[PDB]
Amino acid sequence: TRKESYAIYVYKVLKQVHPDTGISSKAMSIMNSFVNDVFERIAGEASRLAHYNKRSTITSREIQTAVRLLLPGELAKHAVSEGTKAVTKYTSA
Amino acid sequence: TRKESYAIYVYKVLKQVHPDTGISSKAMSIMNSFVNDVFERIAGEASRLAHYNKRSTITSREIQTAVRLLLPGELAKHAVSEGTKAVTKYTSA
Amino acid sequence: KPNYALKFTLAGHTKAVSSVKFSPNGEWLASSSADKLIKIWGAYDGKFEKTISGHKLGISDVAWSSDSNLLVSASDDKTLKIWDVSSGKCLKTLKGHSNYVFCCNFNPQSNLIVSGSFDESVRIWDVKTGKCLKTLPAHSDPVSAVHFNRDGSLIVSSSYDGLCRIWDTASGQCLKTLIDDDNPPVSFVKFSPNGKYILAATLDNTLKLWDYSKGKCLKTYTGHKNEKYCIFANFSVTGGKWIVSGSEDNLVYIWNLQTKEIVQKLQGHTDVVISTACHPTENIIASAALENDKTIKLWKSDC
Amino acid sequence: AKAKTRSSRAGLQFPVGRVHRLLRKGNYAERVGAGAPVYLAAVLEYLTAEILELAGNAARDNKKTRIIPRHLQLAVRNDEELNKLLGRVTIAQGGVLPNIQSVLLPK
Amino acid sequence: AKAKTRSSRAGLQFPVGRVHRLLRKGNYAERVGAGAPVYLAAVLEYLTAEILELAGNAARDNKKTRIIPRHLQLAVRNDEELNKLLGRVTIAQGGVLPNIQSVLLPK
Amino acid sequence: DGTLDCISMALTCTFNRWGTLLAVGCNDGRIVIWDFRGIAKIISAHIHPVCSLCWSRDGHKLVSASTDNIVSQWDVLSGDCDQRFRFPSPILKVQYHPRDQNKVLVCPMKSAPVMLTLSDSKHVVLPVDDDSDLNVVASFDRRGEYIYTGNAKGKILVLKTDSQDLVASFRVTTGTSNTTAIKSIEFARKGSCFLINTADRIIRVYDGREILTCGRDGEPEPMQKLQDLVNRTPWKKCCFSGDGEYIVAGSARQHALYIWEKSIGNLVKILHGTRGELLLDVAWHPVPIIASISSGVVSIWAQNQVEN
Amino acid sequence: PMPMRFRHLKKTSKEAVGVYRSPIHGRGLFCKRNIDAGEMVIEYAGIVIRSILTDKREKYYDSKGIGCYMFRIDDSEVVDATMHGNAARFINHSCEPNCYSRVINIDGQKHIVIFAMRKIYRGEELTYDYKFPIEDKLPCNCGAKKCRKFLN
Amino acid sequence: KVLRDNIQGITKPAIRRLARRGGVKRISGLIYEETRGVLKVFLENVIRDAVTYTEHAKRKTVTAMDVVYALKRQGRTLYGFG
Amino acid sequence: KVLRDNIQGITKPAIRRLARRGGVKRISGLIYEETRGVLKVFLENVIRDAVTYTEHAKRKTVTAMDVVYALKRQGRTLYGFG
Amino acid sequence: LYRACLYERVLLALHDRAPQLKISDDRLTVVGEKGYSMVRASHGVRKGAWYFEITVDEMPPDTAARLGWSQPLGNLQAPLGYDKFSYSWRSKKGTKFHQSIGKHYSSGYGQGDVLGFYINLPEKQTPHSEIIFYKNGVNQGVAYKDIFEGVYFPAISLYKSCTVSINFGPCFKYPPKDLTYRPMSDMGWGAVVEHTLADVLYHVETEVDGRRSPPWEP
Amino acid sequence: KPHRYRPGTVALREIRRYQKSTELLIRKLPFQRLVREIAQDFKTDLRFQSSAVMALQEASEAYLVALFEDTNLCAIHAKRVTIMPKDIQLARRIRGER
Amino acid sequence: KPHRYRPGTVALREIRRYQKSTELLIRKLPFQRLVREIAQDFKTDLRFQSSAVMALQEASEAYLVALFEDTNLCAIHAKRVTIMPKDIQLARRIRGER
DNA sequence: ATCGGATGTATATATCTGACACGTGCCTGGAGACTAGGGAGTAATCCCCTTGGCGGTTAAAACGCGGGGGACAGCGCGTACGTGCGTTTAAGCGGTGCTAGAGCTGTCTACGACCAATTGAGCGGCCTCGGCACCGGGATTCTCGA
DNA sequence: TCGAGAATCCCGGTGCCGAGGCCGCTCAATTGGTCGTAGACAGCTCTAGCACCGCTTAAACGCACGTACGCGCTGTCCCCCGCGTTTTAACCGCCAAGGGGATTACTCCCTAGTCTCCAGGCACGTGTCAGATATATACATCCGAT
């Protein structure tokens, strides 16, 4: 059964931050579960706020607002800046 | 702007249980908010379960299961009965 | 239909007779009265056997032992008294009823006594020690008649409050309460010989046979007169199946058991025929009347 | 063209059509079970009945025709099942149910 | 027409295609914005960077290359904002971060 | 549901043949014969408490067992020690023979049950299957025609009361493959259904005819299986109803009384005693009254009809 | 469930309530075990009949001098307990009732059950509102301070 | 119009009133300001999150439904405001 | 195969091990069984709710994702199991 | 559209029966199972004098039908006389029942009675309106002289398992020889044609501008 | 001679009447000013609904009486009738508020 | 002469090594039997994943050490080093578990 | 432990009213009827995880066993806190007045929706090998009696 | 308090399988049209908020003061920690059966989507009593003398 995960991108960004490091597959699964958790969190919050806004379209403004609702302080600030830079890069082409 | 509610329905069931007893608008809107909250509870839970079943359709069995998940013991039991009654009364249409 | 004819007339009680009972062997007839005296008589010739005294007040009931050896006497002195019928000795005097004791009966094994009193409580008594083993607030009115079932497992009780209550013997449990849509003062009650039915007299000129397993009246018997006094009723079985009773009209009524129809009317008593007794073996009926008669009459039929 | 609402078809009060439109606009599933709105609304009817009933109990316990939110708080705090249902829930004008601890009483 | 991943044009590591797939399959909206998966995936990558960095810090502090869940739990209970985000979350093989109370000490 | 203050140190009780009297043992070693609502007799039985008491069929004799391994027969009218015997391996139980009061079976602690007579001070040692049980309960059937002996190893022997010959046999199971200590064997005063209390806390109801037709070393199934599926509570003492269609068990763990039926086996009801009382003894009125002995105190549980 | 509650009520009715001499009047229903509010106190059990047959029965009892024990189930049915009933025929009335009559539907048949208006304690005499229409006069001795002095 | 120091605008009598409502007999002084802090901290979240809603609402006034959805997201939902 | 009394299968050494992990020095006996009860009560919910999921899952075996969604619904979510 | 009636003759309208009311078109008899219920005919009188019958085919002792007239507003679950808009007879002894009140101003009823029912309403009692009851044509007498306004229709109430049937005039047994009274069928097709014209006039009103009717009197 | 009730007694009756009452126990305007002061920290010149701020104050006071309640309970477990700040802190700790 | 460390000291080191260790502290099979016993209460003969039951036991023990932790804290506020059941009860009370 | 006095609180009363039950005309969501697709349901197949058992081990649990350590009870004091009464103070009513900003309608348009054609990023599966886990042994450091 | 001893840290060496890397092998991602439409935006209201200001007053702050719980200390009991021993069953490894889980392929019942019509719901007026409020009163309860 074709099961999808992210541990490959985990290894990728690890090498991006720590090239000389290994991981326990256990820890990879833990991190992936964490990925899923934050994803469902942000998605549910975005859908809920759009419902409050009666919006049927979830866009990057919703993304940023919901992250700010979820992440604290500089975590949220850095995340907002990063998402902004990335969507700018993608929209540049 | 038309704003829907259930004050009509809550008043109906009030009379059906207590034709004598009155109602305050504050507690009325309290009832309305509450039923909205619990309906969203059951909706999210059933959708989550069906997504686990990966079933794009949401049926009554899901509702029974998820309310059983939701209600503390005997309530659910009582609950499901009338629910069954309902669909029976509606399937017998 | 019976043809009971007067054979022997018995008398001697200085006061109103309250009960006459045939000995289970049919050898004697015990007659109690308010004169504090009991009289044993010959059951076939009307021969006065003896008088047994010792009770301090009037006697409201007397009952034989199954072996025809003992007699319990319930008197208005609030006491019972167990006597040896052969010696006339007061073997026991039962104290504990707080008021006038009106009825008394032995268990089918003759080793136990049931007693009803004016205290509206039924007392259950030992024989060999004469000790009260149980006491029950049975009725809301003075008890009229108490009796055992065929084996001694059930005790039926009647009282002036109109209630007929069946109680458990081993536990005193009030098993059943028979009601007839009114409150007719029940002056007499007893089990059927088969223990299946119950005969109860109410003070409205009415006798009622009830089924125990059904708890409902099966048959009714009228035509007599009984509204104030404790008039006894007996099952005539030595010949045809009849119901014999006294009546306030100086008559001795005999109904058919099944058809409930009067099968004989024995006349000759001048006062209310207060007590009745049916012979256990022969077609003999002792009918004792009240003080305006003071006589007991033996009747013998051929069927 | 005889008309009959699904609520009457269920002989109930809560609007099956309205709640169906609501869940549709709620973006939970692509298709829906047609009897699911009936069922859920019946459940709502039931639970609402119980809570309002306890509310009215407190109300006429206080000779109060029109129910006050304090009645609601007392009701939701008395029943174990409903309290468990709404433990982390707060109620406007709720207040606190009567509760004095043992040692609080002077001896 | 060569096909490059949209995350490349976003210059990111997590598959935004899989993201948007889960999004559409998640029953959140009738139609997802274009850059919304991009933004949220960027947030995800950033926070993963933060947590993995903290984990590597802990592991190297413990002179460990392979990072066991204990390191991650310790870092979790070491970051106050992350803890606040995850204090309601339980951690397998987490144990408890060393916390010693004052009156617990001997004398 | 009604207790008695007039007796103390209640340890063991026994109904007479007709459920009119109750002989209860006391810690002082006295017999208190109480009538169903005062004490009828007091007998100085032993200095040692009495742990086993049985009425005679005529009711004029009572067999009593002290903790001093002293068994004694007493006339209920007089209270005299008609006979007295002593053994090793202190006696666990005595039991008059239901159809011959001269005979009485005795279950000792460590030795095999022995059947004695009162006329002649003889004794017949009943056989033991495994020769190493050291704990075998035994009982007459309803008529005293057979002897049912159950060991600590779940083995069940049915002997004939006269010849002690093995007329039936089978070992009860814990389900899988294991044995269980036979706590007690009880019979019905009416009919042929009997019950077994075992260490598995599961009461097993059988019909003795089915064991007789099952023969030696067979697989007889129970008429019923009865337990507290909720609490898994042991049973200190159990007994049938007088008719034999109701069965009661005494949860000494929580001092409660469970009441099931016979045919269906569904739980009739539950009676709760003082949570602080330790349940010791249980008996049913032979002809709906139930006597309980707990912490030396007796309680009565009746059942009335719709009237009164 | 109303069926389960009704089974429980019919099981406990014989030992929950009694009938004794009443200071209200004659004999009446007293509480023998503390009864909670709203719980089933007692069914007024009896002969379930149609309404059209009431009068023919009533006049019948009027010809027999036997008092009518009838309670209106609804516009179509009546529980007549004159000849066949239960202990509920001995529930006095009070202007301040701790009880109240309600009709329930069990398996299609209607049962008139007196429930407890409040938490009733042992020894209390059971009384409800008969709601008898105003006639032209039965004096009441319920003892309540709000007593209408008359059921009607 | 720059505001400040309304935290101490919370009167100690108000605090002790709330405490008595909570069923408290004896209280120390050290609590109140501490209390206040918590209060602040508590509301510290919601308003922000609330205006966050208003953030996405693109509006200048703040509404109740904001704090409704906040307390909801804060798992402290409230009734009686739509 | 009817199971029972595995609650006491929880060893007091295990309980005190968990307590030491929680940083506890002195413990009383009365706790353990009490502890056990709580334990039971705690799991009392989840498994049921879990199999409730499995209920709707129409399956005979019970999976981790069941308890995942339970603890989620129980507000005690866990990571590392999909 | 049209009000076409599923009937070969003017019969007991199925549209106005209770769900607990059974019919047998072999004799168009009506029967029930629990308590009382009410059924009515297809037609309804508004003026004039007319007449019908009820034939009883089964009357056990626990079976008591009631037969009479009832205006609309008559709850078809009630026993035909429980309200003030219905006037009937109880088929145990001839007893006039109205407002649930029984009156013995009547004759005696028989188990096999073929009962004739005459009733005259004029073109606050309706002036000169009355009701007369016959047993097999023999005058059982006047039942109700006081008759309230509003259209009436013949109705039958069932007790537990009652078997009775309504019947028109051309197959009668003891008919009155009056030239003015009309059988059930005649008033039936009269009302049917009247409602046909009602449909005509309503579709005229909504469809074409204008309306016009002759010199009012008829 | 002047009378003074014993300590707590008056406060006890205050507790009783406050569990009796249900309305707010905070003056409106000070609370509102505090809210707006907090608001300008995140963004200045923001308006509010009176309903909104009423909700804020009600929900706050609810959380606050809950905190006071369970801190009272903890102090019971602390065997004192006086409250200690550590009780509140550790209560939040158990409330996951740390 | 035999040596015995002072009380707690050994338990103190146990605490230290347990905060050092991370694995489970409950025997697998007893926990599993308990789980299946609980399961048959709601429905009998239900199967499980070893991963599932491992998750059950891990999450349980986590909740349990959290309870032990904050009850330790409360007992600090109780000024005792011995634990009292009331501490656990009231902790659950603050944990909303009552 | 009681009684007397103070005080605070539950009650009846009167009226005021403004929420509030009630009824309307008008609107549109709900019902009713019809069409399609395709999610769901069923069934046969495979797999394969689980549940079951069996034997050997010991680390672990049970149990016992002092015994110092603290839970706890009590006991002195004192400081901090209720209280009732002073004082002054903003809180609330209320009513005024402006408009900034919600809040509504009407476009029109960019923007995914969606489908279709294309495929390489990614995933199951297969080696592989090296940090890592275990072990044994030596050296270090805490701790409890001087 | 300086050693003895004990639990621990660390070091080297052994052997392993999971971490990882690479390989077939897609389907899901991309690309590109194409279309109806969500909302972006403009442009109006109006109203609710926002502030103003005055008037009344219940409320708040502080004082003094009793006082009584918090706290600190002592001695006791018991009891749980630590260690020793004995018993056991968790574990672990292996085997085996099947029964359920997952899969795929059909098949079609039901729901989405459309269009029509109207009737229940909703905004909006409208009398009107449940209860808010105030007052005097009768009852309950604390606090101190006896």
Numbering used by the authors:
A (entry chain N), B (entry chain J): 29 to 121
C (entry chain B): 32 to 334
D (entry chain I), E (entry chain M): 12 to 118
F (entry chain A): 18 to 53, 56 to 306, 308 to 328
G (entry chain C): 3815 to 3950, 3954 to 3969
H (entry chain L), I (entry chain H): 20 to 101
J (entry chain D): 278 to 400, 440 to 534
K (entry chain K), L (entry chain G): 37 to 134
What does the paper say about this structure?
The mixed-lineage leukemia (MLL) family of histone methyltransferases (HMTs) catalyzes the deposition of histone H3 lysine 4 methylation (H3K4me) associated with active transcription. We and others have previously shown that these core components are essential for MLL1 catalytic activity on histone H327–29. Compared to the well-studied WDR5, RbBP5, and ASH2LSPRY proteins, the function of DPY30 and the extended intrinsically disordered regions (IDRs) of ASH2L in the MLL1 complex remains a mystery. By combined NMR, SAXS, cryo-EM and biochemical approaches, we find that DPY30 functions through the extended IDRs of ASH2L to restrict the rotational dynamics of the MLL1 complex on the NCP, thereby promoting H3K4 methylation at higher methylation states.
To understand the molecular mechanism by which DPY30 regulates MLL1 activity on the NCP, we determined the single-particle cryo-EM structure of the human recombinant MLL1RWSA complex (4-MLL1), containing four of the five core proteins, i.e. RbBP5 (aa 1–538); WDR5 (aa 22–334); MLL1SET (aa 3762–3969); and ASH2LΔSDI (aa 1–504), bound to the NCP (4-MLL1-NCP). In the end, we obtained three different subclasses of 4-MLL1-NCP structures (Class 01, 02, and 05). While the majority of the 5-MLL1-NCP complexes anchored on the NCP with RbBP5 and ASH2L at DNA SHL 1.5 and 7, respectively, the 4-MLL1-NCP complex adopted multiple modes of interaction. With RbBP5 anchoring near SHL 1.5, ASH2L binding sites varied from SHL 7 to SHL 4.5 among different subclasses. Furthermore, local ASH2L binding dynamics on the NCP also increased significantly in the absence of DPY30, as demonstrated by extremely low or complete loss of ASH2L IDR density in a significant subset of the structures. The cryo-EM structure of the 4-MLL1-NCP complex shows significant rotational dynamics on the NCP as compared to the 5-MLL1-NCP, 5-MLL3-NCP or ySET1-NCP complexes. In this scenario, the MLL1SET domain has to go through multiple spatial arrangements to optimally engage both H3 substrates in the NCP, which negatively affect MLL1 processivity.
